[PDB]
Amino acid sequence: AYRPSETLCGGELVDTLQFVCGDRGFYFSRPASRVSRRSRGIVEECCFRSCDLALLETYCATPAKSE
């Protein structure tokens, strides 16, 4: 592949989440357990696997509203 296989882990993953989503905030991987608690998580797709920009954007926090 033309893309690098460098993966994205640690604080650099958090830095990228802030870059991609801006001030709107983001969510992160929920589980970190040795035991069977399978779930989604940005670390699972960007560090254990490799992820793309469009996918990474889906971890953005939801919009808020107030009257």
What CATH number should be reported for the domain holding residue 8? 1.10.100.10
Nearest alpha-carbon partner for 60 in 28, 19, 26: 26
Q: Which residue has the tokens 């254990």?
A: 48
Q: How many domains does the chain have?
A: 1
Structure tokens at 50: 């490799």
- Count of other CB atoms within 10 angstroms of residue 50: 15
Q: Determine the structural domain holding residue 14 and report its residue range.
A: 1-67
Identify whether the C-beta of residue 24 lies closer than 8 Å to the C-beta of residue 63: yes
Encoded tokens for 64: 């808020």
Q: How was this structure determined?
A: NMR
Q: Chain-centre distance of CA 25, in angstroms?
A: 11
Cα–Cα distance for residue pair 55/57, rounded to 1 Å = 5
